[PDB]
Amino acid sequence: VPDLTGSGEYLVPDVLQPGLTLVLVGTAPSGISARARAYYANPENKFWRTLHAVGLTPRQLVPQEYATLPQYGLGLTDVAKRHSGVDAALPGEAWRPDELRRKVEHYRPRIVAFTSKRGASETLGVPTGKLPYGPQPQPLDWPAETELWVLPSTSPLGHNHFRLEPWQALGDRVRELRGAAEA
């Protein structure tokens, strides 16, 4: 099971632990994110605003606050942890859905949500055009207790496709889970 820094090889640490409600999985860190050693650090990326908008977080975090997410039952990782850049530019060996699956199997989050179709596609082995947004049916190679969701990219490059509904439905689902946990 890798450590959170991949033995110092990861550009930005994973934020993972047991008992999380939601892990949000990107493709790879943008260059800006890699340089900041943070997640979704491009100031035009809508991720941090979106989490606040949909009540996954109660304030808008700044990118350097990414590791505080577990206090709200959220964590973070990416399919590619040792490379940065736009998806189309990444070398083929960047994508390690094998290592992602090992982490999911270890930490058992309630939900894994891919923050773009591409990430989900690299992991599920199916082309993006055949994936809808929202909850998917339980796949491989994958724990049936961990729900899997695919979300519209918050990147500036996905601006033509961005929609809030899958993000808000996710937020509602996380509310429902954290509320059942208390009832």
Q: Where along the chain do its domains lie? A: 14-183
CB-CB contact of 151 with 114 (8 Å): yes
Domain 14-183 sits in CATH 3.40.50.2300: no
Alpha-carbon 62 to chain mean position: 16
Residues ≥6 apart with Cβ < 8 Å to 73: 19, 20, 21, 22, 174, 178
User: Dmax over Cα atoms in the chain, in whole Å?
Assistant: 47
DSSP states of 61-89: --GGGGGGGGGGTEEEEES-SS--S-GGG
How far from 19 is each of 1, 110, 174, CA to CA, in Å? Answer: 16, 8, 13
Tell me which method was used to determine the 3D structure. X-ray
- Tokens 């601006």, located at residue: 159
| Alpha carbon distances (Å) from 140 to 68, 146, 170 | 31, 12, 22
Nearest in space to 47 (alpha carbons), one of 29, 31, 34: 29
List, in order, residues 6 or more apart from 8 with CB less than 8 Å away. none
Burial of 23 (0-12, 13-18, 19+ CB in 10 A): buried
Q: What is the resolution of this structure in A?
A: 1.8
Q: Which DSSP category does 141 fall into?
A: S
Nearest to 23 by CA among 118, 147, 128, 143: 147
